[PDB]
Ligand binder design. Structure first.
Ligand SMILES: Nc1nc2c(ncn2[C@@H]2O[C@H](COP(=O)(O)CP(=O)(O)OP(=O)(O)O)[C@@H](O)[C@H]2O)c(=O)[nH]1
Ligand SMILES: Nc1nc2c(ncn2[C@@H]2O[C@H](COP(=O)(O)CP(=O)(O)OP(=O)(O)O)[C@@H](O)[C@H]2O)c(=O)[nH]1
Ligand SMILES: Nc1nc2c(ncn2[C@@H]2O[C@H](COP(=O)(O)OP(=O)(O)OP(=O)(O)O)[C@@H](O)[C@H]2O)c(=O)[nH]1
Ligand SMILES: Nc1nc2c(ncn2[C@@H]2O[C@H](COP(=O)(O)OP(=O)(O)OP(=O)(O)O)[C@@H](O)[C@H]2O)c(=O)[nH]1
Lengths: 426, 427, 426, 427
């Protein structure tokens, strides 16, 4: 019944992917060992859509952890929900790439893709009818950018008709955790623009901006940032996991948000975002959530939506709520701010609601936005790419693996192409 | 006197569970599936002391179908009638029609045959759906085509939830509605339409519900669909059958798009403070804001109106009431059909759900009417379609299913013919 | 059978309008909920003339409460007879006018008149044969002066042939409860002089003077003043509500008291007015009521009748009484005081009696007087209008809504015109 | 019916904490932050059994803002509403406007928008500040300009603490007051003023407090600001809204400077011996020394006076009382508005703080009135400004912020126009 197979790549993709299984384990009432201890019967109604049943009322996740380094699996296996994963799925290499896209794509990737394709083939045969795949990686580095982008092309060859979702965190200019980030970002987007049908543009800079303004966290760690992005992955797959008044599968939101084949880079968000020291002094009904959803300082991307125009918006909701207040609020945000919305579409909002909210909250929603303001983050990495590429700097490491110099220019031809697409419909 | 029903999409089964619970409580049918001629037109007799409805719930997505299997009304419906698919339509007219529609229609086709072969008094069919999404556009348009070549002569009463001028749940619904209407124009004998924001306005000003949900929207809608067929269930002084809605409301074989409105809709506290009689409800049903569609009837002209009352209502005041409506100069009837009044009566009164938002009323009426008021609505839906069609937006998904840009032009010019047909007929 | 539809405007019109339904509910024996608990069968004989029948032997008033502020309806709904009114009839705005005629007539009125005209249309269609409308407002302020004067023009357009009664309380110079009172009074009379066929000139100053001299109230509130004016509204509509030896409908008194189209501003009064501590020391037959009616300190207007001459007088009576004592007393009041009555009419008194008096009294009457002494209250407000208008004071607020300066002068041309009419026939 | 408030400067929040504690004790709101329609106009309803005020405290200096964070009324207010800066104004109109003002107004602008969007019965705004310092002059003049272009139509009720003729806390306050009044003349609908030595004289002769503090000054001031809005909170026999103060008191669009005075102000021991009725308070409110400004009303003429009573007070004696005020020849009303009386009533009486200096009273009144008595005050402030402006004293700081000597002359000639407007209108 539309089973989704999870797949992880890179250090960050395994961390946020690990947090994804943790947060959904709580609402489903899954123990760290694998047994069920929930309360509602609807949790078992669609537990198979991510997990696999087993003996003793045990449920094993349908995850495949892929990382070229071995230490990443040791940290994930020793986590709170590290033992629930299957030991056979922990496939990994020995010698890391060290922030090199050419290694994880050509030399170090070719020896491991044969070991992961047969595993996901086994998982795809176990389910009754698969819907699609969702992947977590990062444009920076070599593992998540190299290993993830490679098997995306192979999965497209093996499953061209199924949905190919991707949650890809991109770099930022002010927060730079890698010197070779724009080359990996420029080489990765050449594969993401053509192969996958969906993409979520997540930014680490905004993940630091979002925690100061509303959460008021004095000591935020990566685990706190993983809680925000993991909740977004749960909102997109809510209606098939629990019933609702209006269902919206991963395909139902893709057809509305992807007006063209190449324009599929979304912009995520989440609400309610409120600190623990100011939870009592805020309401939880629908109008405060609507204005917070469309707020500029709410999304986890560094893009200014006021500098552009939204192509389409999708706001998945959770929990029992009234439909009149939901529908009427989405009318005024597009009417009062018609300048920041394209006139060549009559309605830029996609609505959907569920009845079973997360634990600890009574009403919540997740934002999915495709807008022309995404180009400002793509040209700056392109400028950092073209600035470093024009002198042929930091290319001798990539050519040692047999990579051609023109492939960087072919990626550059794609880089200024996608930013020009959003400029066309602006 | 029997009739088969079918529910399609998220919109279909969501009101289907809400309407059939209203049907069962009228005939004394408990939810467990048991307690002479009034219930035979919807409910069969399974051997002895057990019944089952004459309907089927079909939907590709399994979340809503299994909710009925795990819901309270489990033993009432058949297990095999709760048909379910494996792949979602996803706001795609094509995906629920060609790829995923072909591998599921064959269980659906032969089931209606055996369901009708056991029956003997089959009047027709009535389908509940919504062209505002993916499942109610493609799969609904396919099943009506395949049974029309088979049956043909039997009637088809469509019930769709159309989008509003400005409020909308989806974004691709002009493409979903413009494609499915190309097939609906030739095979649908009649199609009653309801708007999504209009029904909110009904419970806002009259029922004073500031925060309702879709469950409440289906209750008053269940009163509409049950009242039109109420004459066939119980006895009435002037009986009207299912084929009355075809001849008396369809002036031309292509113009088969009536409207719908219902009154009285009063709260519990307001029911004791507000008088209930034929005069006020007749003036209220013709009120423009009380209609279920955001279209001004003053701009157009009524081709014909079909009145149908319930409860203890003598035929004197209903005739005197419409005589006052004829004298009202604010409205305007078309010269092509001056005597466009069809009145009906049923002794059995409007029911009431336990704990429902609607209050008890000793009498009610369900007014259906055709007019050229929706001519601007089709022009509105066509105008917004030209904006996205000019940019070729959302086209790669439909052709990604198997279709092409050819029939997109066929649906455009078909609406262009439909637009001028309302303009020339309204002269 | 000559149904009258009630209508209210302004704070005072809702208060005295609320008291109007209260006092008549007692003589008709109507419960505060809506059921009947009276004793006489004649109360149901003409209960339809103001009320609407309903299920359970319940009777609901045919009233429409209109006020631009929401707080006025909360006080009326929370009153003793607040629940008997229909909930749907409580139409009202949000943002008050704040003593501005331009707001309630042009900007804040245009958005609400569409919501009240359809309600009175529903009530007018419910009755068999409507006679006319009676309204309660105040010339002071913006709500009663603006909203009331506006829909009076619209009702004239919709119902030009029916009777249009109005109970309008005017300001006074000594009791000044509003700074912008003469502008509102001068702008309101332009509509009242031309649209309505009847008008009752009530004064707040005399409503305090009347309570000191005969009632001897030590602590009078607004509710005590409402009792005097509410009883006056009941006396004018007695003969159609209960049978009588000589019937006088609202049209039967209008034809006698309105000798010209513009001369329709009456002057009300009521009797017997006597304190509780001096009730035993007074009789209740007809001659003491006659001399009390024509007394100068009996009416609820600040006009001196001795300074002018009565055009016409109408004294509706209630309760069983002898006709010789009634007719003979009206002869001597006009004969002995021939100087204070116009010689160009042979008889200035209109007589009419009913058999069913109010509860707690056996003989009573209500005064309706059109006199040339009414002009003294109109010129003083005109002087206050002209004194403030000559320097264009307090006009910048009215021009903000788009009001023209000449419209104040057009009202001024009407102001000195109506006072000159009564001077012609003096 | 709702209204948003804002506090600026040292003067603003010092009375804001003193006024809001008076507001909360009236509605039974405990200081911890919890206990139907009376409190909705100031306090919201957050989910279940919790409220928050509809106001914000903004101030550049953090000493007063953090005192509220560490003060007793911590749980009552929102932690995010307590806005704080990082650099002080220092008696500079320019420093709180151009350098430091620009980097803090943007959090302040968008907060009022979302605070108003969630609301639906927004009547207007009222700001508490003081032009006698730096923060209440520049930043207050900036925020009112930026919301006036946005809203405009909504009212603005300013509350400033002006300096006395001879007593003064600062030395540069003529430059601070003359600059900020140039912006206040065009965008402020009305501005009630209070003098610093006058309120000391109120508690000196009447309340016999020889050694009070600013905390005591804010209590009786809280009675004034709470009494003008008391009609909107509780029910009254003659209701008056917030827009009543704009039309009834502003004769011309530039002359928008009323006065303020309050009575009775009696101690605890004197309250039991001194009779309380409408006659003595009406004669006391028009008493010149009992006013909150050191300006002789005998020199000028009252344009219009707005009376507003509280407690059990019948409308007979209030009309008879003002009738005696009209007969007094010691006062003199202007011929341009003879009937300049506006009386109001509220059934809910004046409250009392536990342990406060004010005693319990069964009735009170808050009398606001415009007049030309402050024409000499503006001439006095302008005269002392010419002494320092002639020597070009204290000018190097203002131009040291970014301004120049140009607008210094614009503020001077603006007062020169304002002075003669009071002289010609008072003829
Ligand atoms: N929101 C979070 N971001 C993270 C986290 N860990 C890393 N990152 C961010 O993602 C950036 C790159 O992602 P990765 O850490 O996975 C580098 P990767 O493992 O793919 O390559 P190698 O480790 O060199 O084999 C990294 O520079 C961080 O900005 C995390 O736990 N949470
Ligand atoms: N005899 C009575 N007179 C009243 C009463 N209430 C007010 N008034 C008088 O009528 C005068 C104005 O009438 P209103 O109170 O209705 C002012 P209105 O509501 O029309 O405008 P807004 O309140 O500003 O929206 C007022 O100044 C009083 O002198 C009352 O209850 N009884
Ligand atoms: N008035 C009303 N409309 C409804 C209700 N349920 C669904 N709808 C409408 O139906 C439209 C979509 O219909 P469907 O084709 O059934 O949607 P779906 O079955 O979820 O299709 P998928 O997204 O592909 O799964 C929505 O836009 C809603 O506005 C309801 O209970 N009341
Ligand atoms: N009556 C009264 N006046 C006050 C009170 N608090 C402050 N003031 C006046 O406010 C004036 C200065 O106002 P502000 O602009 O707020 O002073 P500030 O915030 O300290 O400005 P900086 O010195 O730059 O920090 C002083 O001259 C005081 O006279 C008070 O509690 N009561």
């Amino acid at each position: 019944m539309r089973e989704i197979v999870h797949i992880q790549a890179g250090q960050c993709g395994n961390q946020i992917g690990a947090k994804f299984w943790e947060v959904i384990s709580d609402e489903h009432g899954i123990d760290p060992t694998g047994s069920y201890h929930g309360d509602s019967d609807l949790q078992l109604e669609r537990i198979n859509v991510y997990y696999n049943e087993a003996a003793g009322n045990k449920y094993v996740p349908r995850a495949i952890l892929v990382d070229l380094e071995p230490g990443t699996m040791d940290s994930v296996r020793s986590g709170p929900f590290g033992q629930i994963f299957r030991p056979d799925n922990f496939v990994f290499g020995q010698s890391g790439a060290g922030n090199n896209w050419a290694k994880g794509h050509y030399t170090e990737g070719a020896e491991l893709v044969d070991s992961v394709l047969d595993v996901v083939r086994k998982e795809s045969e176990s389910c009754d009818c698969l819907q699609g795949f969702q992947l977590t990686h990062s444009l920076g580095g070599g593992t998540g950018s190299g290993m993830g982008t490679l098997l995306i092309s192979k999965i497209r060859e093996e499953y061209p008709d199924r949905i190919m979702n991707t949650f890809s965190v991109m770099p930022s200019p002010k927060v730079s955790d890698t010197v070779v980030e724009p080359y990996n970002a420029t080489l990765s987007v050449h594969q993401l623009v053509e192969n996958t049908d969906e993409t979520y543009s997540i930014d680490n800079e905004a993940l630091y901006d979002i925690c100061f303004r509303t959460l008021k966290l004095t000591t935020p760690t990566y685990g706190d940032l993983n809680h925000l992005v993991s909740a977004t992955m749960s909102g997109v797959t809510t209606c098939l996991r629990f019933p609702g008044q209006l269902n919206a599968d991963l395909r139902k939101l893709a057809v509305n948000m992807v007006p063209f084949p190449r324009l599929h880079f979304f912009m995520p968000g989440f609400a309610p975002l409120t600190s623990r020291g100011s939870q009592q002094y805020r309401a939880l009904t629908v109008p405060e959530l609507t204005q917070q959803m469309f707020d500029s300082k709410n999304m986890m991307a560094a893009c200014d939506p006021r500098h552009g125009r939204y192509l389409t918006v999708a706001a998945i909701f959770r929990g029992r709520m009234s439909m009149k207040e939901v529908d009427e609020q989405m009318l005024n945000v597009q009417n009062k701010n018609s300048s920041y919305f394209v006139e060549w579409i009559p309605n830029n909002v996609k609505t959907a609601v569920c009845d079973i909210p997360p634990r600890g909250l009574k009403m919540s929603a997740t934002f999915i936005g495709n807008s022309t303001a995404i180009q400002e983050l793509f040209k700056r990495i392109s400028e950092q790419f073209t600035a470093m590429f024009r002198r042929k700097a930091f290319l001798h490491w990539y050519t040692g693996e047999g990579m051609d110099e023109m492939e960087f220019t072919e990626a550059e031809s794609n880089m200024n192409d996608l930013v020009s697409e959003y400029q066309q419909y602006q | 006197r029997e009739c088969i029903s079918v529910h399609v999409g998220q919109a279909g089964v969501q009101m289907g569970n809400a309407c059939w619970e209203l049907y069962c409580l009228e005939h004394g049918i408990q939810p467990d599936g048991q307690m002479d001629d009034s219930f035979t037109t919807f409910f069969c007799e399974t051997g002895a002391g057990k019944h089952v409805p004459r309907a089927v719930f079909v939907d590709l997505e399994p979340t809503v179908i299994d909710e009925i299997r795990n819901g309270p009304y489990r033993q009432l419906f058949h297990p095999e009638q709760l048909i379910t698919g494996k792949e979602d339509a996803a706001n795609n007219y094509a995906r629920g029609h060609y790829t995923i529609g072909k591998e599921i229609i064959d269980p659906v086709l032969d089931r209606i045959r055996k369901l009708s072969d056991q029956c003997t008094g089959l009047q027709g069919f009535l389908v509940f759906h919504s062209f505002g999404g993916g499942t109610g556009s493609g799969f609904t348009s396919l099943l009506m085509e395949r049974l029309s070549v088979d049956y043909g002569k039997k009637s088809k009463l469509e019930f769709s939830i159309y989008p509003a001028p400005q409020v909308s749940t989806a974004v691709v619904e002009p493409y979903n509605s413009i494609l499915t209407t190309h097939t609906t124009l030739e095979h649908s004998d009649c199609a009653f339409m309801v708007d999504n924001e209009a029904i909110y306005d009904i419970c806002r000003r009259n029922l004073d519900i500031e925060r309702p949900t879709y469950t409440n929207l289906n209750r008053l809608i269940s009163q509409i669909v049950s009242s039109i067929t109420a004459s066939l269930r119980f006895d009435g002084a002037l009986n009207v059958d299912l084929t009355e809605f075809q001849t008396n409301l369809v002036p031309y074989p292509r113009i088969h798009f009536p409207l719908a409105t219902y009154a009285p809709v009063i709260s519990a506290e307001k029911a004791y403070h507000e008088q209930l009689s034929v005069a006020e409800i007749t003036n209220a049903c013709f009120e423009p804001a009380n209609q279920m569609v955001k279209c001004d009837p003053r701009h157009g002209k009524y081709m014909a109106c079909c009145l149908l009352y319930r409860g203890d209502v003598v035929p004197k005041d209903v005739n005197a009431a419409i005589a006052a409506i004829k004298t009202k100069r604010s409205i305007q009837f078309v010269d092509w059909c001056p005597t466009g009044f069809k009145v009906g009566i049923n002794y059995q009164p409007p029911t009431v759900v336990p704990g429902g938002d609607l209050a008890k009323v000793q009498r009610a009426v369900c007014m259906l009417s055709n007019t050229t008021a929706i001519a601007e609505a089709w022009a509105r839906l066509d105008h917004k379609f030209d904006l996205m069609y000019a940019k070729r937006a959302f086209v790669h998904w439909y052709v990604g299913e198997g279709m092409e840009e050819g029939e997109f032009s066929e649906a455009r010019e078909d609406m262009a013919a439909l637009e001028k047909d309302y303009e020339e007929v309204g002269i």
